[PDB]
């Protein structure tokens, strides 16, 4: 899963 999601979850 992309960092943009990983970092904001």
């Amino acid at each position: 899963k992309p960092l943009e999601e990983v970092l904001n979850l």
Partner: antibody
Framework: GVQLQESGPGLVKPSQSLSLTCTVT?????????WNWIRQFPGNKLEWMGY???????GYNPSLKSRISITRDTSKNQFFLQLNSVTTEDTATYYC???????????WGQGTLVTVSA | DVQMTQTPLTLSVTIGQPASISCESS???????????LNWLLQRPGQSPKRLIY???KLDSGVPDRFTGSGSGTDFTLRISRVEAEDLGVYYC?????????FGGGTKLEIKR
């Protein structure tokens, strides 16, 4: 100096475990972003190894999951890479880098040469 | 494991002339959230990779107008309007929508003189 720095042995005998350190200067490794480890093999070939997020979460490259491990020391603001059971194939240039893939923040270190040989 | 293919393997440009590099991914890099995580890196001799473009077309700071990125889905294009001496080095293409993240085989740019 600079912003990101790799330190560690430059030589490691096969079968043992490699251990690298990335000292981060200028920004808190707990604030934001993903702190990765990338390595460049003799041929310009780049391989992302894994990262550890500002929250302690880790992600590893499946080709390495078994023998890879990434940790950090939030007090000394630095993160580590532990690669076990190295072989001469693990010889390469190791870089630590920070980025999130969607904002302006992007920094690579200068990298360290790690050669595996008896 | 998603492959990224770049062409040409080498590129010989005269200073002042325009240049363009291509990158093909084995799968669409479009993410369900609409964005497509594709970045461009330049590695100058004796230095570590430097990101030039992110999100297919956004230029990183300190990067000149000369560099433009474009494409979508599976095909991407890095283009330099006017090549400069300082533009020599190897260009990498990298994706971040599929796990693990993957790099391109690189494209070496040599100044013809």
């Amino acid at each position: 100096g600079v912003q990101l720095q790799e330190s560690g042995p430059g030589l490691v005998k096969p079968s043992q475990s490699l251990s690298l350190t990335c000292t981060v200067t200028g920004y808190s490794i707990t604030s934001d972003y993903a702190w990765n480890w990338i390595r460049q093999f003799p041929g310009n070939k780049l391989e992302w190894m894994g990262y550890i997020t500002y929250s302690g979460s880790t992600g590893y490259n499946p080709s390495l999951k078994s023998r890879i491990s990434i940790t950090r020391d939030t007090s000394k603001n630095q993160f580590f890479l532990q690669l076990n059971s190295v072989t001469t194939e693990d010889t390469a240039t190791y870089y630590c880098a920070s980025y999130d893939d969607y904002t302006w923040f992007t920094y690579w270190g200068q990298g360290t040469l790690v050669t595996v040989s008896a | 494991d998603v492959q990224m293919t770049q062409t040409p393997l080498t590129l010989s440009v005269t200073i002042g002339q325009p240049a363009s590099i291509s990158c093909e991914s084995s799968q669409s890099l479009l993410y369900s959230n609409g964005k497509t995580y594709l970045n461009w890196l330049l590695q100058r001799p004796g230095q570590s990779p430097k990101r030039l473009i992110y999100l297919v077309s956004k230029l990183d700071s300190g990067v000149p107008d000369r560099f433009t990125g474009s494409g979508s889905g599976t095909d991407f294009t890095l283009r330099i309007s006017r090549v400069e001496a300082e533009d020599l080095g190897v260009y990498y293409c990298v994706q971040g929508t599929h796990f693990p993240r993957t790099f391109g085989g690189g494209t070496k740019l040599e100044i013809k003189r």
